[PDB]
Amino acid sequence: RVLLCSAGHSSMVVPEAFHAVPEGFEEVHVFTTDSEKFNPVVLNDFFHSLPNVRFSITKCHGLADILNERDFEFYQEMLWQWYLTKMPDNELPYVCLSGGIKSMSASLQKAATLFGAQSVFHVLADNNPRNIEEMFDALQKGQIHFIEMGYEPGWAALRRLKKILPINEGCSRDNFKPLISKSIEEILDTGKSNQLPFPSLAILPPIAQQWLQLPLSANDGAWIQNLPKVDLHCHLGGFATSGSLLDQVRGAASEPDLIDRTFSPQEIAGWPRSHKSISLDKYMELGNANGSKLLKDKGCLIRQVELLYQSLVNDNVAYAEIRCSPNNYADKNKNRSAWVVLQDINDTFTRLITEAKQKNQFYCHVNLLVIASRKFSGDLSDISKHLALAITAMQQGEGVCRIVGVDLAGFENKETRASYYEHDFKAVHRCGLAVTAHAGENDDPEGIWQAVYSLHARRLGHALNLLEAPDLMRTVIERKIGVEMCPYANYQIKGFAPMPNFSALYPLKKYLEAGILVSVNTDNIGISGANLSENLLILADLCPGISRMDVLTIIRNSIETAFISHDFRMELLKFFDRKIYDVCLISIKN
Amino acid sequence: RVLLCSAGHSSMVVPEAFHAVPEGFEEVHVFTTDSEKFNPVVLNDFFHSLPNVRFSITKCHGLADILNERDFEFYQEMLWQWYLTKMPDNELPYVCLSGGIKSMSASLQKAATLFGAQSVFHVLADNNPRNIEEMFDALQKGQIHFIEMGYEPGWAALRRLKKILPINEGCSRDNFKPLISKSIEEILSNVKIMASDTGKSNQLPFPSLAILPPIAQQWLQLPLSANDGAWIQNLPKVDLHCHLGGFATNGSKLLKDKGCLIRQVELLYQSLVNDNVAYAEIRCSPNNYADKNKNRSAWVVLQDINDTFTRLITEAKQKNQFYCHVNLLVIASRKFSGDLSDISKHLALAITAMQQGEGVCRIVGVDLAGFENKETRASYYEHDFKAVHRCGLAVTAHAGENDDPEGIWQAVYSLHARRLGHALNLLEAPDLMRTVIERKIGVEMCPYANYQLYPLKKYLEAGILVSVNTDNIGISGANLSENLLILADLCPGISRMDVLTIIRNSIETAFISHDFRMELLKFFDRKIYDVCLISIKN
Ligand SMILES: [Mg+2]
Ligand SMILES: [Mg+2]
User: In which residues is ATP 3 bound (chain A) (predicted)?
Assistant: First the structure.
């Protein structure tokens, strides 16, 4: 073990602390001011009798004693740097405070309680011995007291500053940034006080408990990636659109002869950070290289599903729901019916889940979503076909990758407000499925009312114009209705701050403070060119002033709004709680 | 602003610390041991020179100095106790550390880190001044120096130990108890359990009261005993279903006048506060109480109810004493054939009444109670509810006691009832269980009402947001604390955790605004924390 000490007038308190553990101590490292009242020769001869005990001596060069604010802050930053440098890599260092005047003793105590120490304590003797032949009988008589106030874990993970900040033993106060000063300066609203999800978030030391409340920044990439996230609006057809993913899915086709390798979607400057707003038609056009024209192949379908699952696992996602269009990928020529396609995707996902779980690795439990599209070019019987297919998949029953519900989506040019397609949606609720609705992407605030009150839809897509219907806000809020929303996709197809020639503000922050159960999603990964992590991170320059804890409550809302069973909700909540606790403990160790 | 400092052998710290802040302070408290070396006369006269600010001296009885482990632990306990009796109620205080020898300096810094402080600092003087005039002189020359440390927020949950013991009327060594040691050991054990185990580490399913001692959590996991009556009485509660007219059992025959209604409302409020209930929703019958011959319309009666309730709420709040926010629900008695327009009248009255706006008490929803029958199903009144949801109201229902499961289904889906009354036989339709589960439709079930095997346990296992209510206090002759008490013997194997789950489900199913729900969550969390932390000792 390694012990640390600081003393003033007293010269050999370190030997007194060296008997704190009856077994003994292994390493000794003492840091103190440049005052001459400390005697290094006595400590040297004391520790020379024990060669097996390492004895390293360091002093505050250029500072005999603390006298003013500048001297105090200089000594504080140097002892901080020495403390980060000198602790054991995996063990908390030992430390004692039986010596030194108030300033350095308090500074070392605060540094120890902020980083952590194996045991801080005090050693006092009744007879205040001056020579070793005195403290020998002082400890023999028991006069020396081993004053210990309690174990001090500190922040179990903060020492990343040892590496992210280069170790510089020789330096002055002229160049140092106290990140801790910024993390302490502003700590203490009702919301951030009591919207704490994941009850274990009350357990982290007050440093982390308040750090979670700081505004989110673009430099938060590793931490946001290391969180377990949830995606609820993902289109499988838009996963692979270009690049290595497209090459891999194309090469896995059963018959590569009929693979159109000539088409190539055009580039958008700065994509995904579009230099200007884009229309919906071109947004679908960028996904023309994939979709249904290429995914008819069974091998292509298997490769796409496996690649999507692998990417979802790589993005640290723990639960997801996938929107699929089984009818679009059916082909009667090869006896590839829509039901067969859905069954194959179910078996593939179940096999992937089982093989990931059997190895006790990280896996994202995945459930499907069927798409009852607007059915362009008429032929609305496919709506009933899709509902029947979903119902059959739902009472299929056995398995793990279950179908949870249906999705209604499509173009808003037809002006469908959940009334045209209401004539058949009555039967689905009897079985026990769940209904979403892509409503009001750019339409009037009227259709959503029937979408929630006649369709009984528990989720909404986008609905970015909800801010102008406060009456709709109130009824949405009381009914606990989730709102799926895609940051990058909406930003690209509509335009929001801060790109030039636009004044529209992203309604996310007001949606959160209102209390709408909004869950951030990614829509089409390949076309947008951004995974869940990037979509979450873009909120920094999308909605300024947002804090990490709003992200945490967004994740909690995403858990809440998923069409899943109760017991699975408890288990997933427990796993998310533990994982997120470890993440905020260890990842932000920076 | 409050200054706290330790007194050793010299009067150096206190005046320089008091004048260190340019604005100055208002309350200053200094802690010291039983040592006769220190003198209080200088500080006494200095603070008497400025009597506008407050000052006090606390002496650690029976301890002149620290000479062993027992002496130091006793001093630390009394220092922590003096600190906790001396937090300002809301704001964090300032701390000066330069007093005493390094031992009490470190103890005071530990106290500041543990309980949080506004801005702790150090004070040093080169010339070691002695008497007031030359302290002032040295401060004139700028020899004074304040060494600011930082701003510790501290453990928010650990500022709540003032409730268990402000002071033990000057405890002696014979009856001394290390309560602050209990606090520090509970928090360190919680952190160590978090860091060591994983199975216990991840469960944590509740509002972040995880910071109780592990012994407290183990006691909570234990099943209810019939002797926990004091504990449940002390816990804040919520009564989402209470009928005003059935308290003094009355109603149509007696309450036609005005003074009787006022005294009934006051009695209901007094009884409701008497049980420490923080929130309740009341269903009333304005048409049953109107008197046309006296020019007493139903609207007038409802306005009088709202006015007396909000007046009482304001009166209770002005005293800063514990008060119970109450909202009103307009009943729609299912009178069937008689005066079929009464239903439309009641809903229209509700829409008009909820729009009054100003008033802490308001109308948040309507009720569908009345004579239940197949003809009285939800598919009979549904022509009239196309607009109650349009104006943003809320609807409850009472079905399942003798009705049919498809009636419950249509009530859930046609009326879009946010809540539900009774429906004890919901087990026999697992499909209905799933429908009520995923839609998060609450259930209001009163154990005494059905008492006059109970499946509530199975309801918690499945996941119904079950709320326990009084229905009608008077005819049942029991309050909500009694209702919670019957669950012990009435349902064996019920754990004290499920009582808190019932309370939480009740506060989620209340027809309340988002911000009001947020405030109620915070207040409920603080109150349950305090009450369990107090009651675990006894
Ligand atoms: Mg979409
Ligand atoms: Mg009742």
Answer: 163, 575, 578-579
